[PDB]
Design a protein around this ligand. Structure first.
Ligand SMILES: [Ca+2]
Ligand SMILES: [Ca+2]
Lengths: 105, 62
DNA sequence: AACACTGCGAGATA
DNA sequence: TATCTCGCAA
C-alpha cells in the first residue's frame, strides 16, 4: 500500500522523481492513474501536483534498460481537470482557458 | 460583469472575431484531438453566418 | 528491470 | 568583431 497524496494532491515519489505503478494496488487510494502520451505535458501545464508513472521497463539495444513513463498519477479530484487538459465544447474550452489564467498569474 | 465576459472572450491572440484558426489554436493547446472539420461548437456558434464568432455570439454560447 | 539534459566549441558574419 | 547554426557528448 503506497502512502496517500496530501490534501493539495502531492504524491510521494521515488529517488528518480517518478512513481512506480506496476499493479493497480500501487496507485494511492486517493489517486488515479492517467495513461496518455501527453498526460505529463498536461499536468505540467496546469501546474498541478502529479507524479510521472513508471508502468514498465523497455529493454533496448546496446546494454541498457529504460523506464516506460506511460503517464501520470494525480489525486482523484483532479482527474477531470487533467482529462480536460489532455482532452482539449465551447464552455469546456472557455472554462479551461479561464482556469489556465487564474492559475498562471 | 461585461469586463469579465470580454476578458473571457478576449483570451486569444488577436482582439479584432473568433476565427476558425483561433478556436483551433485553443482547442489544440488544451489537448484536443479535433479534426479540422470538428468545429461543431464554433461552427454552430455562428449566428449571422460570417464563418466566425463575434462577442454577442460568444455570449450566447456561454 | 532507470541517470540525467542540455553546454560548448567548430565555422562563419554583418 | 558580434551572431547564428549546428554538430556534438552523453
Ligand atoms: Ca480573432
Ligand atoms: Ca458570426
Amino acid at each position: 500500500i503506497p502512502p496517500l497524496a496530501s490534501a493539495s494532491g502531492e504524491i510521494t515519489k521515488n529517488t528518480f522523481g517518478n512513481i512506480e505503478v506496476f499493479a493497480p494496488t500501487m496507485i494511492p487510494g486517493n489517486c488515479c492513474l492517467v495513461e496518455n502520451p501527453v498526460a505529463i505535458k498536461a499536468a505540467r501545464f496546469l501546474g498541478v501536483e502529479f507524479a510521472p508513472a513508471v508502468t514498465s521497463f523497455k529493454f533496448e539495444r546496446g546494454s541498457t534498460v529504460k523506464p516506460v513513463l506511460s503517464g501520470i498519477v494525480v489525486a482523484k479530484w483532479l482527474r477531470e481537470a487533467i482529462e480536460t487538459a489532455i482532452d482539449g465544447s465551447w464552455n469546456t474550452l472557455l472554462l479551461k482557458l479561464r482556469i489556465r489564467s487564474k492559475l498562471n498569474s | 460583469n461585461l469586463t469579465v465576459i470580454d476578458d473571457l472572450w478576449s483570451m486569444l491572440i488577436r482582439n479584432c472575431v473568433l476565427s476558425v484558426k483561433d478556436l483551433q489554436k485553443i482547442s489544440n493547446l488544451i489537448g484536443a484531438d479535433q479534426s479540422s472539420g470538428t468545429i461543431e461548437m464554433i461552427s454552430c456558434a455562428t449566428d449571422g453566418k460570417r464563418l466566425f464568432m463575434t462577442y454577442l455570439d460568444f455570449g450566447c454560447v456561454l
